[PDB]
């Protein structure tokens, strides 16, 4: 009875579609990472170049993608983006299949001309897939979620938290499953599994999106050389000036600045851990702890929003993250690299930074969701994504400039500083919304 109603409701179908999409995306990302680390060796330069390419492409095309999402029907945009992403992933999987089958041959076919051709083709396909994924995220997590929630902020916060939990769980699980598949068999079987899973997921998510559109009737109403390139530049300029003129500019600015960091767990931090003499089991349990603290951050954000308010929740999350970051700053000056105390303190700071950062991210995304007109949602969200990946591009450039372990600690400090800047900027926004009642939570008395 009730179980069937819950499994038939729009929220569950949306959750299922998002879970399938993120599982497939994470599997494909791990496959590409394995290809890069094995065929070309453990080179940070190539990974940084790939990140540079994807970040720059999104930076340039974000306004265009947002405008396209804004000026078209909701069902068509989502279906087209999903089809494009899944087709791109399938083609990349087939190409990786053919590359992996001829391992020794391609390693000795020529000086590397065919190898570089395969690299650039994979990079282009991955760039297209990332653009499609960004379009899907903009059209689903910013447009459809609000319409499904309606006039209920608690429901919107719960959906955002559940999406974040699904993302964290798939991030911690799917790489392990696909790695076990690869290690029990061969990478070719892994790529085949990627391709088949993405095709079946394409079909299932198409059907699920149709069902979601049918179940919510409020999604059908929407309120609104040089000559060829004249209009995209106008769209870019208009989107950026509109984003700059928005009153929630500071919050998105700080969220973008928060991406300028090396204190994650999918970055060269794992390389530093390996260079400090830590086994893989320690890394696995640390990743599990990071996922657990992400879930804790989501639930803490929900409770803090319910009890205190959005802006004060953001302030509390920022203060927590800053405390974690100063713990890391204390860590870097301890004895160690320019013996276990330094790495232990750094990792604890990283995990607690993860929980604080997830709380802050949820606060900022809700603020952007509920304070933007529905006729400019896509363009503002696209410009926000563009700034986030601009900061990611800067991070990749910095990692390229200082690859040696010895300077890594210095890099850490820079990251910390930028985080502080972001929160400081958010603080100003808080003032512009709260004035002198900043440190007062609860009903007035």
């Amino acid at each position: 009875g009730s179980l069937a109603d819950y499994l038939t409701s729009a929220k569950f179908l949306l959750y299922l579609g998002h879970s399938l999409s993120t599982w497939g995306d994470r599997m494909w990302h791990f496959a590409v990472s394995v290809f890069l680390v094995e065929l070309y060796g453990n080179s940070l330069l190539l990974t940084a170049v790939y990140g540079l390419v994807v970040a720059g492409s999104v930076l340039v095309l974000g306004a265009i993608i947002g405008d396209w999402v804004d000026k078209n029907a909701r069902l068509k945009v989502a279906q087209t983006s999903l089809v494009v992403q899944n087709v791109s992933v399938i083609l990349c999987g087939i190409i990786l299949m053919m590359v992996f089958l001829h391992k020794h041959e391609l390693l000795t076919m020529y000086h590397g001309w065919v190898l570089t051709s395969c690299y650039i083709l994979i990079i282009t396909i991955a760039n297209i897939a990332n653009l499609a994924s960004t379009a899907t995220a903009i059209t689903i997590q910013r447009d459809w979620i609000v319409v499904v929630a309606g006039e209920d902020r608690s429901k919107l916060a719960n959906m955002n938290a559940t999406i974040r939990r699904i993302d964290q769980l798939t991030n911690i699980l799917a790489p392990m499953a696909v790695g076990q598949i690869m290690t029990f068999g061969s990478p070719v079987i892994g790529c085949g599994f990627i391709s088949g899973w993405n095709l079946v997921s394409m079909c299932v998510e198409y059907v699920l999106l149709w069902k979601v559109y049918q179940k919510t009737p409020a999604l059908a109403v929407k309120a609104g050389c040089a000559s060829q390139m004249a209009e995209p530049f106008r769209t870019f300029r208009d989107g950026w000036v509109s984003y700059y003129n928005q009153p929630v500019f500071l919050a998105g600015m700080g969220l973008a600045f928060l991406y300028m960091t090396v204190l994650g767990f999918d970055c060269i931090t794992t390389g530093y851990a390996y260079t400090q003499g830590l086994s893989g089991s320690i890394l696995s349990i640390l990743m599990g702890a990071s996922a657990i603290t992400g879930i804790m951050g989501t639930v803490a954000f929900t409770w803090l929003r319910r009890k205190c308010g959005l802006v004060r929740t953001g302030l509390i999350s920022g203060l927590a993250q800053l405390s974690c970051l100063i713990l890391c700053v204390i860590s870097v000056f301890m004895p160690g690299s320019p013996p276990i105390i330094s790495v232990s303190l750094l990792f604890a700071g990283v995990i607690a930074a993860r929980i604080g950062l997830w709380s802050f991210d949820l606060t900022v995304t809700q603020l952007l969701q509920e304070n933007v007109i529905e006729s400019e949602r896509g363009i503002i969200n696209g410009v926000q994504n563009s700034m986030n990946y601009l900061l990611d591009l800067l991070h990749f450039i910095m990692v390229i400039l200082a690859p040696n372990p010895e300077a890594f600690g210095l890099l850490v400090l820079i990251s910390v500083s930028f985080v502080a800047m972001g929160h400081i900027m958010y603080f100003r926004f808080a003032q512009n919304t709260l004035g002198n009642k900043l440190f007062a939570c609860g009903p007035d008395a």
Partner: antibody
């Protein structure tokens, strides 16, 4: 049909306590921000403050800080404005307004307005 | 704070002529200006939001324009039902401030 009804025809002596109500029909005050606006006769429109009925966070304008107090009741779906230390300058017309978010584009629905006159 | 100044307080007009009402900001509010129209003895209504977007139900003769510091509301063809008081409100920053208002009266 979203509607907001208010009390009316308030006559009060200087230096007393005044309570205005704002009952909402067709929606829930919990999902919106409830604002209060004052209009002095032959004058402009002034902003008093806003309240969030979900949690009780109330923010006021600097001028109407120690004089006004905004409360809300979700069960009865009604906002309340409390005015204290009344003076002859406070005779005006008060409106109850609805806002979507912190920086919502507009006040879509307004109340009928309550006329407050203080006299001797 | 942000002070909104409307220059003219009484604009004399005739039926069937374009009417322009100006609104000036003390700082750069961006595109956050909403125009409200109110007849005498009734609650204020909604005409334009975000300085360019017209609300659902407003006649097409109302057009908003401007950005940054200067904003203007234009009526293409004045009718007898458009004689009221119009004011501009910003929402870029708190506390919210309203305009002084402009009253439209016919010519004779």
């Amino acid at each position: 049909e979203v509607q907001l009804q208010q009390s009316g025809a308030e006559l009060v002596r200087p230096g007393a306590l005044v309570k205005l109500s704002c009952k909402a029909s067709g929606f829930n005050i919990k999902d919106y921000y409830m604002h209060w606006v004052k209009e002095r006769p032959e004058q402009g429109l002034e902003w008093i403050g806003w309240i969030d009925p979900e949690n009780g966070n109330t923010i006021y304008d600097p001028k109407f800080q120690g004089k006004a107090s905004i409360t809300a009741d979700t069960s009865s779906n009604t906002a309340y404005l409390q005015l204290s230390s009344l003076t002859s300058e406070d005779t005006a017309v008060y409106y109850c307004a609805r806002k979507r978010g912190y920086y919502g584009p507009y006040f879509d629905y307004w109340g009928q307005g309550t006329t407050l006159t203080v006299s001797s | 704070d942000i002070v909104m100044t409307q220059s003219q307080k009484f604009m004399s007009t005739s039926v069937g002529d374009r009417v322009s009402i100006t609104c000036k900001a003390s700082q750069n509010v961006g595109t956050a200006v909403a125009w409200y129209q109110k007849k005498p003895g009734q609650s204020p209504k909604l005409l334009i939001y975000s300085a360019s977007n017209r609300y659902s139900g407003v006649p097409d003769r109302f057009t908003g324009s401007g950005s940054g510091t200067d904003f203007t509301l234009t009526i293409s063809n004045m009718q007898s039902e458009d004689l009221a008081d119009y004011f501009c409100q910003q929402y870029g920053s708190y506390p919210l401030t309203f305009g002084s208002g402009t009253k439209l009266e016919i010519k004779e």
